[PDB]
From a paper:
A standard k-turn comprises a three-nucleotide bulge followed by successive G•A and A•G trans G(sugar edge)•A(Hoogsteen edge) basepairs. k-turns are commonly-occurring motifs that introduce sharp kinks into duplex RNA, thereby facilitating tertiary contacts.
However, we have shown previously that in other environments, this k-turn (abbreviated here to HmKt-7) adopts the N3 structure. Moreover, the various structures, with resolutions in the range 1.7 to 3.1 Å, have been determined in five different space groups, encompassing hexagonal, tetragonal and orthorhombic symmetries. Several include multiple molecules within the asymmetric unit and altogether there are 17 independent structures, all of which are unambiguously in the N3 conformation, and all in a closely similar conformation with a small RMSD values. A given 3b,3n sequence confers the same conformation on different k-turns irrespective of environment including those within the ribosome, in the SAM-I riboswitch and in duplex RNA both free and bound by the L7Ae protein.
Residue numbers in the entry:
A (entry chain B), B (entry chain A): 6 to 102
C (entry chain C): 0 to 117
The structure:
Amino acid sequence: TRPNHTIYINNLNEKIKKDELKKSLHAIFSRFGQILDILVSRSLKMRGQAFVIFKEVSSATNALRSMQGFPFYDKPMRIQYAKTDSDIIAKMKGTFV
Amino acid sequence: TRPNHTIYINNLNEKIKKDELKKSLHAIFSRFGQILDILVSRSLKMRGQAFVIFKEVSSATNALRSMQGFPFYDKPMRIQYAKTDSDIIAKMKGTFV
Amino acid sequence: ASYVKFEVPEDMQNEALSLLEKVRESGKVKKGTNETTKAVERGLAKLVYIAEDVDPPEIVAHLPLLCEEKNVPYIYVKSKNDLGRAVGIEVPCASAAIINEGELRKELGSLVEKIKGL
RNA sequence: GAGGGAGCGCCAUUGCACUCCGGUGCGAAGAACUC
């Protein structure tokens, strides 16, 4: 997929409450640049994805080369770029990715 | 230092509240094995430091080698081993007094 | 003086503030005058505290009369500072309201049944 | 403003704990946050 300032992570641990999950993404991705918003899925039963929205695409691609496969809560993140404005739709629809 | 079940992390970002920080360190350290406890305080003398108590010292040394200098909250952690066993490790060998 | 509709004697005010120091660890109390005005019109309050020395009287002046309209007990206490340390906050507090009868209901029902006799 | 309900700054601190505990301005007379 072509670059985009939002990265789309899945294989996130589903069982983890979501404020904590957002904050733990922040813990590990603030290093790469200003985050406008962290957007996690909901919930618990369906799988786990989240969009982290960087403000500059170079930071997003930085997250992606670096944190690929990193074991977040003992589950290696499968990380790619978000597709054509997937994040703004996922925030609509209600419920939460 | 001699290896130890417990790692001593410092140069942590001190602006972050206690439970958020404990659960961010479980997020990035669970990977290396069972964590018996994570002890953080923000007393004047314990700002910016945390103790992570692994159950097997191999988890501690794999953790200390992998996460060395990892920018947690945009700040490279200093990981070394704890100088003395944590009380709970002490009781598991008992040793505790 | 003078949005106080009735006077109440010191040591009944003091089991009141100490009793409210003890209800936070069984039930639930709402602190500050916006959450207590909201405790009451929601229709949930079971007894509400008003400080006597709040300094634009109008901050709490509507509380006595919007306790009489839907029949909620209320008690006056002298310093907002003591109600502040009573509810557990670190500033002063103009008015509070217990909202859950977690387990001490007899001991406050007595206390209300002392509010009536004035 | 409507919601909301307790934090938000500054100075100092690089500090090895497992009884808790620096200073200080603002904050229930409403912090953060959402709209």
